[PDB]
Amino acid sequence: KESLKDRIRLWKRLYVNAFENALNAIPNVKGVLLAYNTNIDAIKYLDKDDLEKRVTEIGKEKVFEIIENPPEKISSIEELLGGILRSIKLGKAMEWFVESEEVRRYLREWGWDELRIGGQAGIMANLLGGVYRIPTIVHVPQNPKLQAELFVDGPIYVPVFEGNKLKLVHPKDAIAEEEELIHYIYEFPRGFQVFDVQAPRENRFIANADDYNARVYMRREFREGFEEITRNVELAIISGLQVLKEYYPDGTTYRDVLDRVESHLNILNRYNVKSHFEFAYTANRRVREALVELLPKFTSVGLNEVELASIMEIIGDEELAKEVLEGHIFSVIDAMNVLMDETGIERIHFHTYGYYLALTQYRGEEVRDALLFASLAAAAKAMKGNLERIEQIRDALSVPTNERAIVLEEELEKEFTEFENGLIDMVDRQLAFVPTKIVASPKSTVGIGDTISSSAFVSEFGMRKR
Numbered sequence: 001k002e003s004l005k006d007r008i009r010l011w012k013r014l015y016v017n018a019f020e021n022a023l024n025a026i027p028n029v030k031g032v033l034l035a036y037n038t039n040i041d042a043i044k045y046l047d048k049d050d051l052e053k054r055v056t057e058i059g060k061e062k063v064f065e066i067i068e069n070p071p072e073k074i075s076s077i078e079e080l081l082g083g084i085l086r087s088i089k090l091g092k093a094m095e096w097f098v099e100s101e102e103v104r105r106y107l108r109e110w111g112w113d114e115l116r117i118g119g120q121a122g123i124m125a126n127l128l129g130g131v132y133r134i135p136t137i138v139h140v141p142q143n144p145k146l147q148a149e150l151f152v153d154g155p156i157y158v159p160v161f162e163g164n165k166l167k168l169v170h171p172k173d174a175i176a177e178e179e180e181l182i183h184y185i186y187e188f189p190r191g192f193q194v195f196d197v198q199a200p201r202e203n204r205f206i207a208n209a210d211d212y213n214a215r216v217y218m219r220r221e222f223r224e225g226f227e228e229i230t231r232n233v234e235l236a237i238i239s240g241l242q243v244l245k246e247y248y249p250d251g252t253t254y255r256d257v258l259d260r261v262e263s264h265l266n267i268l269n270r271y272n273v274k275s276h277f278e279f280a281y282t283a284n285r286r287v288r289e290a291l292v293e294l295l296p297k298f299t300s301v302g303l304n305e306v307e308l309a310s311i312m313e314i315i316g317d318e319e320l321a322k323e324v325l326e327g328h329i330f331s332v333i334d335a336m337n338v339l340m341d342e343t344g345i346e347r348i349h350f351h352t353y354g355y356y357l358a359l360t361q362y363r364g365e366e367v368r369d370a371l372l373f374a375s376l377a378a379a380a381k382a383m384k385g386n387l388e389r390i391e392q393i394r395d396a397l398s399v400p401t402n403e404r405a406i407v408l409e410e411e412l413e414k415e416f417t418e419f420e421n422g423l424i425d426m427v428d429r430q431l432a433f434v435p436t437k438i439v440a441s442p443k444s445t446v447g448i449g450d451t452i453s454s455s456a457f458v459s460e461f462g463m464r465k466r
């Protein structure tokens with residue numbers, strides 16, 4: 001007989017092993033490409049007193065109206081503060097684009113407490129190159145001194161044309177007189193309260209003041225030299241495409257970018273580079289559909305509940321979509337299988353609060369251990385806010401494993417086989433499952449997702465190398 005306390009012990013043991021497995025496998029990974037979104041994250045830790053004053057100055061009325069009538073993008077200070085309060089009320093990760101110049105000035109005056117690398121590729125770069133020491137090539141749309149220096153020391157590189165020769169240099173050695181792409185990040189803890197609104201869960205509002213990543217502008221090197229860049233890596237992780245709109249007022253379309261991305265995938269595939277897509281929520285239906293059609297060209301995809309559900313919705317499975325959005329684990333599993341049926345993709349990594357899943361056409365415990373590694377990395381990132389040394393991830397071993405997910409696994413054993421803890425066989429697929437490590441009082445919430453997907457993908461690959 002295997003009880004709950006025994007199960008708690010068993011996961012502690014598998015967590016410890018996995019961390020060791022990952023450590024030994026990571027040095028095998030010979031290069032990762034990361035694209036396309038890199039920016040600056042300007043982090044403010046909200047203050048009740050300060051926030052209230054600001055709302056009050058601009059007009060509390062208008063601000064409170066905006067909480068109920070949320071715009072699509074920020075065009076005034078009211079809509080900014082409305083967006084922030086809304087984010088607090090709903091305890092929700094939100095991000096709105098800042099079109100207004102006057103607001104950008106307001107954002108910069110209001111300032112920040114901490115400056116960190118930003119964007120999905122950027123955050124992943126610091127982690128993979130700086131913490132894991134995997135040689136990393138990263139797309140950086142604009143590289144002024146302030147941008148470049150947020151990169152930690154290590155094998156992090158940007159491609160640069162010198163003659164016909166393409167060189168790989170550290171970002172601090174490719175500084176140009178270009179734009180600061182600032183994302184303003186407003187973190188709040190569980191129970192944060194402003195006026196009569198209290199936060200149910202810890203989250204952040206992001207006021208996105210970044211005109212380049214908005215349209216996915218690519219550097220010369222990536223447009224003209226993608227092939228030479230590709231010869232340098234074994235892995236690629238692609239993100240940032242969720243921003244794309246079907247139409248722009250300037251007559252351009254999403255197709256301009258996706259045709260380009262598809263060429264990249266064709267090149268990646270010609271070199272047998274394994275690629276992972278972060279399929280962030282894509283508001284534009286037509287674009288979401290186009291992204292789904294690209295999925296067969298990727299090796300792997302990462303997603304959460306609303307992402308999985310939004311995908312189910314466009315292939316015409318609304319019953320399943322609603323159930324995924326309701327958090328029903330067996331519905332999540334069916335959605336992953338449907339997605340794999342639709343696309344033939346090798347790997348789907350799903351993450352939510354308390355547990356991860358990975359569905360794969362291939363087999364092995366490496367899939368599970370990578371989920372476990374990533375779970376620790378996520379926990380460590382939440383504790384420390386920003387990661388710097390792989391040994392800091394060892395600290396996450398003492399964060400308790402989510403007890404609800406441990407119990408949930410009993411349900412998985414009854415429904416599916418389970419040949420090993422957290423490991424399920426299907427006829428031509430394997431399903432890995434992991435109870436995660438939820439940090440009660442996190443230092444920051446930005447970048448946790450990035451840490452999850454990239455950590456599982458790269459450590460899995462490393463561990464699977466024969």
Ligand SMILES: Nc1ncnc2c1ncn2[C@@H]1O[C@H](COP(=O)(O)O)[C@@H](O)[C@H]1O
Pocket residue numbers: 093303304351352353354378379382437438439440442445448449450452
């Ligand atoms: N306090 C926390 N501790 C550990 N993991 C977290 C915490 N908050 C969020 N996460 C993880 O980070 C993910 C956020 O990913 P996403 O919502 O896809 O950007 C969640 O799905 C969780 O798995």
Ligand SMILES: OC[C@H]1O[C@H](O)[C@H](O)[C@@H](O)[C@@H]1O
Pocket residue numbers: 037041095117118119120123183206208446447448449450
């Ligand atoms: O993953 C966190 C990142 O997600 C999004 O790209 C945000 O716009 C960016 O500010 C943040 O750096």
